[PDB]
Amino acid sequence: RGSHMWIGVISLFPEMFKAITEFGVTGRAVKHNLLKVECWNPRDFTFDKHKTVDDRPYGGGPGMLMMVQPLRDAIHTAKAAAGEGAKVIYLSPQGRKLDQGGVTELAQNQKLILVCGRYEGIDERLIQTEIDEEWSIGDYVLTGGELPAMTLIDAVARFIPGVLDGLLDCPHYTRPEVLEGLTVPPVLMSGHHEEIRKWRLKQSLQRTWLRRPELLEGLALTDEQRKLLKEAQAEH
Amino acid sequence: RGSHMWIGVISLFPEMFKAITEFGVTGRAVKHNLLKVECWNPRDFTFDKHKTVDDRPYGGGPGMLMMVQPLRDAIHTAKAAAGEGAKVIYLSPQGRKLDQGGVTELAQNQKLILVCGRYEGIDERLIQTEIDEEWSIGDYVLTGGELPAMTLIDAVARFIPGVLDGLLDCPHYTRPEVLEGLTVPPVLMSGHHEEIRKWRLKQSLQRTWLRRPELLEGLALTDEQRKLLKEAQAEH
Ligand SMILES: CC(C)(C)c1cccc(C(=O)NCC2(NC(=O)c3cccc4nocc34)CCCC2)c1
Ligand SMILES: CC(C)(C)c1cccc(C(=O)NCC2(NC(=O)c3cccc4nocc34)CCCC2)c1
């Protein structure tokens, strides 16, 4: 149309992204030219014999950093290929927390460049001069930002035209009817779609309430949803 | 010793895990027999001609589910290979939030089995009969649980003996001294390691304070850390 999404990746390990470009939903999205994922490797932007990509930190210590020159130059080549208006994102443990709202924001960009850290990360000044936003997938210690980048790609790809609420899912049941002695809720077997709808929405709201209450803090629930939630809170 | 960690994976797309078994820190950990990652594919546990792995939900609707039989039987084969005492984890959007504390808990298990969902997920009753715990990497909509599983593997692998605080990092600086006109904080160039230590710890605490305050809510800071934080709060 062209609504195809383009995502550039800066990574020391571009072959990892096969995990999203060759498999599943994203893989089908790449096969049908709805998503293009392009990788540039800082290892290819070095000029010494040994293709060095780490550097010592000013101040000393054991924590190596990504070498500034090969990293910056990969970013620039990626910006040159994106053309005007690509948003550059540092997958960073000190970034803004990723959540579904954040995903919808990022999905509104047609060109993104993802920068994946290694070692203890990248020079602070590279954030000022090259990074537009910093995003984190959660508060845990990883060894690189590739997996966070792929998670991020997977989440945004669902907003690409041609690829196909905010609360937790209701329980799902498939065959068989009785599984190790455990039976499906009769309402789902009943065949009355209006009782099934009310139950599924009510169970969704109770799950959200019990297991992730904070997802409710930003919604104004519908009349029906407030009624079904109040019932479920009392029945508990 | 044997302290080698073993992680079984149940996935419709086992080839994705090459992204952690063939690259980086985890790849070195697999090459040196410190971590073993074994995959079983529900597609291999089917008995129809077309190797069907999805099923319709009781209650109707467009949301397909993982078919119970091939999934359950892959889990069982994985449990049989683990031997006594493997913890089975469903990577699930309705699970307990992953955070560094959670990672250290999970890293205390020598055998883990990771179950990765596809479609809208797995039968509720399979959680009662086969899943020990449910874990989520964050509040966003993905298309499968493989990437969450790999993130989880990456985080726990750092606790394997032979592979090598809780606050956000201080800013890092490497060469060059002046980068697009931006200079390194003089203290890092100074060569006095005691001033460098105090600065790095103080900047770490301010970052944590400003960008992720909630990481402070579970610590009793040291005398030095409380002093450096109070200073930084006033200087802001
Ligand atoms: C937050 C807290 C747990 C206190 C903490 C403190 C200090 C360091 C780290 C840490 O994990 N540093 C290592 C690196 N991690 C990530 O890149 C990374 C990690 C997590 C989510 C992410 N989302 O995008 C990129 C992410 C950074 C550069 C190389 C890997 C984490
Ligand atoms: C929480 C909220 C955003 C409201 C929401 C509501 C409803 C569905 C989904 C959703 O993403 N469902 C799809 C699946 N997602 C994940 O498996 C998954 C997603 C995120 C983190 C994870 N950590 O481990 C596995 C994870 C589940 C089965 C196939 C993929 C998310």
Same structural domain, B127 and B215: no
Cα A78 to middle of ligand 1, angstroms: 23
Cα A111 versus chain centre, distance: 15
Closest residue by Cα to atom 6, ligand 1, is B168
Task: Answer whether A114 touches B (CB < 8 Å).
Answer: no
Same structural domain, A72 and A148: yes
Q: Which residues contact A93 (CB under 8 A, 6 or more apart)?
A: A121, A136, A139, A141, A142, B168, B169
Same structural domain, A2 and A105: yes
Cα separation values, A153 from A150, A214, B155, Å: 5, 25, 20
Rounded Cα–Cα distance for residues B23 and B37 (Å): 13
Q: Which atom of ligand 1 is nearest to the CA of A98?
A: 23
Which chain B residue's Cα is nearest to A15? Answer: B19
Query: Strand A133-136 relative to strand A178-179: parallel, antiparallel, unpaired?
Result: unpaired
Q: Are A209 and A232 in contact (CB under 8 A)?
A: yes
- Resolution reached, in Å? 2.7
Same structural domain, A126 and A9: yes
Same structural domain, A159 and A187: no
Reference A88, options A64, A114, A67; nearest CA is A114
Same structural domain, B87 and B105: yes
Solved by what technique?
X-ray
Q: Are B185 and B173 in contact (CB under 8 A)?
A: yes
Looking at the structure of chain A, the number of domains it has is: 2
Q: Which atom of ligand 1 is nearest to the CA of A122?
A: 28
**Residues 42-61 of chain A whose Cβ lies under 8 A from any Cβ of chain B:** 55-60
Reference B180, options A127, A58, A42; nearest CA is A127
Which range marks the domain in which residue A216 is found? 165-236
Q: Which residues contact A74 (CB under 8 A, 6 or more apart)?
A: A10, A40, A41, A42, A44, A45
Same structural domain, B151 and B47: yes
Same structural domain, B157 and B226: no
- Among B114, B148, B164, the domain-final residue is B164
Same structural domain, B61 and B127: yes
Q: Are B91 and B117 in contact (CB under 8 A)?
A: yes
Neighbouring C-alpha atoms within 13 Å toward the C-beta of A21: 17
Q: Residue A214: which CATH number?
A: 1.10.1270.20
- Among A164, A179, A209, the domain-final residue is A164
Burial grade of B217 (CB within 10 A; 0-12, 13-18, 19 or more): exposed
- Among B112, B129, B164, the domain-final residue is B164
Q: Who among A24, A66, A100 is closest to B141 (CB)? A: A100
